[PDB]
Swiss-Prot record:
Protein known as: Disintegrin rhodostomin
Motif extent (Cell attachment site): 49-51
Record organism: Calloselasma rhodostoma (Malayan pit viper)
General function of this protein: Inhibits platelet aggregation induced by ADP, thrombin, platelet-activating factor and collagen. Acts by inhibiting fibrinogen interaction with platelet receptors alpha-IIb/beta-3 (ITGA2B/ITGB3).
Domain Disintegrin stretches: 1-65
Length: 71
C-alpha cells in the first residue's frame, strides 16, 4: 500500500525503485502538487458541473478532496 507516491514510473519527482518521492518534494503528481510541492488549502482544485460548490484544495494533500454532492 504505502510504497508509491506517483502512478507514473517515468516521473523524476518520485524514485521509480520505490515509486515514492525521491527528492524533498511533497508530491510528484496531484491537483495540489505545484512544483511537486503541496499547494495551499482553499485552492479551487476543481470545479463542479451543476450548482453546488467547486473543490477547495486541502493544502496538506497532493490530490483534491470532494464535496458530499459530487457523484
Amino acid at each position: 500500500g504505502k510504497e508509491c507516491d506517483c502512478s507514473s514510473p517515468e516521473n523524476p519527482c518520485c524514485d521509480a525503485a520505490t515509486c515514492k518521492l525521491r527528492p524533498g518534494a511533497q508530491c510528484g503528481e496531484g491537483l495540489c502538487c505545484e512544483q511537486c510541492k503541496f499547494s495551499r488549502a482553499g485552492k479551487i482544485c476543481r470545479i463542479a458541473r451543476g450548482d453546488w460548490n467547486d473543490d477547495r484544495c486541502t493544502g496538506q494533500s497532493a490530490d483534491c478532496p470532494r464535496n458530499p454532492w459530487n457523484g
